[PDB]
Design a binder for this molecule. Sequence first.
Ligand SMILES: CC(C)C[C@H](N)C(=O)N[C@@H](CCC(=O)O)C(=O)O
Ligand SMILES: [Zn+2]
Ligand SMILES: [Zn+2]
Ligand SMILES: [Zn+2]
Length: 697
Amino acid sequence: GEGMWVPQQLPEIAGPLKKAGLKLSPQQISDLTGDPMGAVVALGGCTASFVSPNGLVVTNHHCAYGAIQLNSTAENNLIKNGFNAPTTADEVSAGPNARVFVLDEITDVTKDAKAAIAAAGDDALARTKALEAFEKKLIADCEAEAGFRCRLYSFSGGNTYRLFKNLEIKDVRLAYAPPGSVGKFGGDIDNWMWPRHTGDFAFYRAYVGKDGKPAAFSKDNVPYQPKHWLKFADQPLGAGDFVMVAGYPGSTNRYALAAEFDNTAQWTYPTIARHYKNQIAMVEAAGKQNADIQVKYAATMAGWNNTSKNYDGQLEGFKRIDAAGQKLREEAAVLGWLKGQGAKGQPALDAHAKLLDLLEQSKATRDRDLTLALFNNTAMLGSATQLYRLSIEREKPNAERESGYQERDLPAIEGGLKQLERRYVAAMDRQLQEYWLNEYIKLPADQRVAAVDAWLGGNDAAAVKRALDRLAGTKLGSTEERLKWFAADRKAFEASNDPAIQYAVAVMPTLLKLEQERKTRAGENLAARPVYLQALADYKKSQGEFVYPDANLSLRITFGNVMGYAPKDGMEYTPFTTLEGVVAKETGQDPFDSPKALLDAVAAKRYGGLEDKRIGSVPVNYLSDLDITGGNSGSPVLDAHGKLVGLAFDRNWESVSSNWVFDPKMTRMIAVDGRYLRWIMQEVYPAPQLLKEMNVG
Ligand SMILES: CC(C)C[C@H](N)C(=O)N[C@@H](CCC(=O)O)C(=O)O
Ligand SMILES: [Zn+2]
Ligand SMILES: [Zn+2]
Ligand SMILES: [Zn+2]
């Protein structure tokens, strides 16, 4: 059911947990470094878990896609063919920015953080700077111990703050991925859909240095030895069974204002979705005629497709359940309720009006702000602006440098400059510059930027062509040139003839003021948001309701049962899909083109000892009433005894609106069964060494 529960709410949900079927004590689950929660890790945007004492990590194929794509070329395409390392020495690096974060400690710093903010007094921009200075000093102290990275989380709009300390594993390697025809069976046609028939899993291995401390890639590193790992279920998972997920959901907007909902639904989603579809259509065309572009843009294309399809789904979802109507009605009840406590409620109603003025200021420049951000996120312009901003921050002491630009951030910056090599083709990138210059032109001068106007030197197609031809002269298309500018000082940038660099130097002043503007609004948000949200929580508690914070990239627990749903009258989706259903979808062409060994093993009924007697076949995917969002991919699904019964990877079509307004009837998680993963690895694309390591072969 509904709820992304923080672990410190386990006491509250210990009862609901038992009634749903949890057989372990809630006590054992609240041990975040014990069995089995201590096996659960964060990847940065995905979840994973340890499944052997020698550092083997299981996650989704789509979470591993970036790493697999970084190790692919037109002639040796791992996305297409899969990868299997017979020995740990054949494992390839997942890239320099790949991480595994192992939770060590959590601390409440709420009082301290609130005191730091309070001291800034009644100046918005000063409140943001005071929180940033608090966070930096807190982080530098937490990170003093070698091999740990830390993170400060804000919950419920600033009402609670907790500090997470993680062991940061820095050498992560790809150990197995099934071919893409399994890992992403059905492609974008089946994405966000049930019925689903997709083997969305893959495996990494975590490595540390010989002294046991984390270190960057080296052939002298050895497997990490986790204190906790997961074991495969010994009991068959069936309809109605208890399941639970632990992982790192990124973002939900359930407690937002009705008008923030309106703005997202009416402007942000249709605008982003349109842009992504435009860029999809360009890069698809180039890739049909150029297999280098196709492989180098594949991870990017997977993201555009995923996000745009999500946004379409949410908009359909909003209509279906009248989300505008529900937000409007519930916000009346809340306002109504506060007005009837007079002076007690007054802080919260002031908070409310302030929030709407912050919304209006941001709406006033929405078009400029989105368009400029996305133009500056093309490869050469993103490189030049990032690298020049770094040269400006290098002139300050580390403690005053902007977050993203301190010493602790230098390894990610350098890594990203090298990964870029595998995701850039000059001719493709030129077309994307072109698209974004056309979108810039089509702003009213109302939403325009003095420095870009000046730098373009004209407002027409001729000006766009000139810009394109000017920027074609950059040297930043080579990794080595990027790395040179990575170490150069600000005067060197300022003297450069590189046309991408000159663009960065021309726009930087504007970019910093725009950033100052954002920090000012955020500083107002810091005063108003926590007051409003406390009062929203106080209201919900009056209605006797469930209370949990919106997702914010921290560790959450969701629980419930295996079950289908009814998409319309006369029909019901069943909880499981099966092998025969994979084959019934076969067309011989992308994306319904299973490997031949899958086709044969299913026509022969080679179930490998994995048949669930109740369904008469090996289960492939299953539905449940768990509550997940982006960031939960790769999370282990555990049964009543805390054993592994699958991996979370998607949500059904009708549920994706649940990010804003929850719908219990049609909100389900889609997971890949642990038996399908075993079956693929025994019968289709075999990896008997991994099966043996996990004590299932
Ligand atoms: C490439 C496809 C399978 C990605 C999924 N559609 C997806 O976005 N999955 C997310 C988890 C489910 C959710 O968003 O609610 C995710 O990647 O975290
Ligand atoms: Zn263990
Ligand atoms: Zn280096
Ligand atoms: Zn049988």
